[PDB]
Design a protein around this nucleic acid. Sequence first.
RNA 1: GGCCGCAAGGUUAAAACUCAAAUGAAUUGACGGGGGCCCGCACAAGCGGUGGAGCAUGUGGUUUAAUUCGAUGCAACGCGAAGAACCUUACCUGGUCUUGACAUCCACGGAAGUUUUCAGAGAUGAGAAUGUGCCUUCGGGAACCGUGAGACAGGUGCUGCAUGGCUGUCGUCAGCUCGUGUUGUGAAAUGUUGGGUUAAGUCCCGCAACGAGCGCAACCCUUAUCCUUUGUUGCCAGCGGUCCGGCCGGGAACUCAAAGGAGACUGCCAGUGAUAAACUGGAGGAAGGUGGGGAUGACGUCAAGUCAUCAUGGCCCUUACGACCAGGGCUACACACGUGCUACAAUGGCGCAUACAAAGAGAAGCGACCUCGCGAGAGCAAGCGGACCUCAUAAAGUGCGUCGUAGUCCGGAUUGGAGUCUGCAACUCGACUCCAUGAAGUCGGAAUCGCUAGUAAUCGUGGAUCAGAAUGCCACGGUGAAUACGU
Lengths: 206, 100, 151, 50
Amino acid sequence: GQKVHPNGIRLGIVKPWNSTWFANTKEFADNLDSDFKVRQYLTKELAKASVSRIVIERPAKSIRVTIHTARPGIVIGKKGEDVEKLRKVVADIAGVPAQINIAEVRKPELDAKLVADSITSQLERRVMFRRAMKRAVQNAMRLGAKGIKVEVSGRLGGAEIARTEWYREGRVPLHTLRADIDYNTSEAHTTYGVIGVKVWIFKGEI
Amino acid sequence: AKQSMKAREVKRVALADKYFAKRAELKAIISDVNASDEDRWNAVLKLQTLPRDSSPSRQRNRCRQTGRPHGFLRKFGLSRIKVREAAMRGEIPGLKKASW
Amino acid sequence: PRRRVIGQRKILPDPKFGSELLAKFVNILMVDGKKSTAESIVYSALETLAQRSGKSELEAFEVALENVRPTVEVKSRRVGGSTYQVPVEVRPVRRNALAMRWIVEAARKRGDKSMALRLANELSDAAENKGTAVKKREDVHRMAEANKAFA
Amino acid sequence: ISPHVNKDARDQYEIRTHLRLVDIVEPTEKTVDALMRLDLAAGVDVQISL
RNA sequence: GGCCGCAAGGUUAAAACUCAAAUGAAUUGACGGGGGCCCGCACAAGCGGUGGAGCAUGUGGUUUAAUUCGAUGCAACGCGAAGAACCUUACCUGGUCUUGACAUCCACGGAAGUUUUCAGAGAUGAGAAUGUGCCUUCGGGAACCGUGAGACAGGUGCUGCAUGGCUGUCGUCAGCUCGUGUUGUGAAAUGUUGGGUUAAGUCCCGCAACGAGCGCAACCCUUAUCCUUUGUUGCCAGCGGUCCGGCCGGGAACUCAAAGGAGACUGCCAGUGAUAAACUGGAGGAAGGUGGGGAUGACGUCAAGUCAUCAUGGCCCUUACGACCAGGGCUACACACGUGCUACAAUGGCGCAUACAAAGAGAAGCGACCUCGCGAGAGCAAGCGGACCUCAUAAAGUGCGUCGUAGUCCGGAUUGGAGUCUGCAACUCGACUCCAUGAAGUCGGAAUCGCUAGUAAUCGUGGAUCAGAAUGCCACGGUGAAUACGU
């Protein structure tokens, strides 16, 4: 049958939130809309910088945004000339003072969003999907994970009938609520239609 | 939704913001007791010459991301599908699955 | 059930007298969770019944029950494609239960004015060996007797 | 939770709001200035009444 | 055709034509009106309903200018809709525009408040007032109103038999598989089978197997018993005032509020059992053997549902399958079916007056006290972004009277007259109030549904959607049963 969302079911037990502010009923909807627009703009601008997470906070009467990336140099640029433009445009969108901070990802092969993005990028340049999936699994198990799973669905290889395939290694206990599971997805647009990708990574019990 | 329906909504909100005070004045006249009985008649005849789209009751709530006219929640400004997607991704502060 | 054992629920005694048989009677008479109404009916009936016979309410009640309790009944069995009636013995708890159910069912079918009056009349008739409850006991015993070949 | 018909199959969610009250009985100029000159976390709402 | 036989028949024994197979032995499943063992409101033991009446609401059909599209055995039919008078709206009749109602480009001039005539309106024409900022090195045009041309915009149009994402169901059932080793020419097998036991592929012992993974259980929420912290807006045993009332001085004990801790594990006793795993009973304890209720859905099955939430490959239309506007339709009515509400009465109807809850919502909002109206309501006006004010008075119950088995002092369909409120506007097509009227129906044929305990049955209260429109959906408490020998 159908499965529950790992991140969602784990919120508050072992997983944190991606947004943190208090509001009343006459500010809630507008705050959500502003956050949506900020994330949209940043994700379009930084599509070649390996972004994985955008965290937003609203203290007092300002907005401060933290970006999680594996290539901080590309984002910062020459003495901040690029972060400055980003800050200006973000402040314009939000309508209040703005601030931007940058955080580094040490191991990009143990991050679920980045792995899915890499697989999708390979699929769009006519690479063999078994090859891509196997490489992802091997890299993750070599750099120290306790378990990984990868799944791909669609018109694989150009076929007429759609299909789904998956691979697994190690432990991936999805009914244990104290287990730390990272989960994310991605999509590919090819000449035959859309193809979908899901990734699970297990890191230990807390 | 089509791109024309959202335009319709934008136009409605604009006109209703434009003509707010005049309608309040005329309705106050009509409702108030002990009036000339001719001012009342003239006010009724004048309230119906303003644009129809200036009445706040011609507006319909729509999801801010898709335009859906059904299944709307006021606290969030979205429909049920988008509410669930955001909630599972972790983008709505304080919200989580409940049992009791 | 298949693999179960069920214990016995506890029943509080009556407030006026001190019997659990009377509490069970009130329960069998109640409808829709309205216990006060049923209690009023039962007490009025017992009062109007003790005057008619110059003895205690509990004594009259026991005399009425002893004429409606059954001893044997028939169950239905079908293994060879035909239905047979098989006589079996009744046990005391079921004896009391059946007698109470039959008495109340008969009382509800009368044509007097109020439920208390109908109940009093039925109890007096049972003490005298008359009425639908006694007729029911007789029919059950007749059916049990006609099928002794299948014991 | 389905894009179409099925009428059972629902999800149920909650939001909890926690609240606290503190009373200061004998204020002074320094205390009030210190209180007004403070900054706290980014998910807490503070209201001061005189 | 020959030979033999009384006959029935026996024996020797072809061709034309036609098909790409027919066959033997073993392997993994499925099935059996084959056998063995075990489970489930599956039967049995019980309580209350649907199927007949009137009304609400969905579907089939039929009608219509249109009655917009989708869901169809269990797993469609109070379903997408958590709310169709205009709008929503995707449908019909009529009136109108062609780079466009919604974007990016080039270049030719200039902008928003009021107010007059014709239009059903869309949209055409007349007027009056105004000169924003801002390196003007004059090139700013940022901001935002017109018009001209062409790259373009636009589509709730088709294919869920081209797809991503999301969901139903077998089923909260206990199963589904891999690595190395060994057996067989092989498809495959063992492990996972066997003796016990469990809610459980749960645990123990044996055994050519030795190990591991996804599922089972536990970690998460809520409910029941204690103690340490802090006591306002919540609480009053003791102490003292009297206008009687937690009202005032006070108190921090108790109810309660919400943060840290304690507690339940076959842990202790006796018996049974393979010197086992476990089972039956007992003490203490608020609670005993999964204490009660949630969330949590394995590998897979049905080319199951959704291109009309959204996104997307391939087709298809561009002075039209794309825009705008006023009226109508989605509410029709010989008929068939599903899900509900109200009844057919004395365990009751009507009148008087009097106890006891829980959980929620509230600034274009919730609307007290007081005055007017028979009533739906109206006028004037405090308080509250709330353990403080408002919605807001629980009902079944209890005491006292009356009605006396009647189509009634039971039931409340239908229809006439007079009104209120929301809203530009209640004819088609809203809810509610007063006076009058007072239909079917006296417990429901063959079929058929739910429930094992604070459950069924019965009584009231709140919210989402929402200008206004619940007998539906989602939540809360009060009274409170019957029965389970057995497979």
